[PDB]
Amino acid sequence: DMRPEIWIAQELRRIGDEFNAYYARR
Amino acid sequence: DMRPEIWIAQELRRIGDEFNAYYARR
Amino acid sequence: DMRPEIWIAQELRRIGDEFNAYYARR
Amino acid sequence: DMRPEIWIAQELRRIGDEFNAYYARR
Numbered sequence: 001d002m003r004p005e006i007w008i009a010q011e012l013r014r015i016g017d018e019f020n021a022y023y024a025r026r
Numbered sequence: 027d028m029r030p031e032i033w034i035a036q037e038l039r040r041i042g043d044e045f046n047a048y049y050a051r052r
Numbered sequence: 053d054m055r056p057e058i059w060i061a062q063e064l065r066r067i068g069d070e071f072n073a074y075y076a077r078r
Numbered sequence: 079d080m081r082p083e084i085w086i087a088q089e090l091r092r093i094g095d096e097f098n099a100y101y102a103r104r
Contacts, residue, residue, distance in 0.1 A: 004045075005045075005046070005049055008042065012038045016034070016035060019034050023031055
């Protein structure tokens with residue numbers, strides 16, 4: 001869904017989730 | 027707290043909260 | 053400013069791709 | 079690369095500042 005209030009929230013979760021997965025592996 | 031797992035998460039919440047507040051006003 | 057709000061989602065995707073590339077190097 | 083993880087927080091702050099300036103124009 002490219003409507004901005006869904007898409008922005010999803011991108012923020014992607015950034016946060018990928019950082020946490022990286023940092024746990026690090 | 028500038029430790030990365032706190033600071034990154036807080037910047038993400040700032041971006042998301044500021045967007046939602048703006049979009050409600052818009 | 054004429055930009056649609058999706059510019060924010062697009063920029064979050066772009067920067068998240070930079071973070072992703074950095075994690076993979078590490 | 080060898081960048082500190084806080085480069086991510088610093089970049090999120092910088093882009094969040096751009097988003098904030100956009101909200102003020104809108």
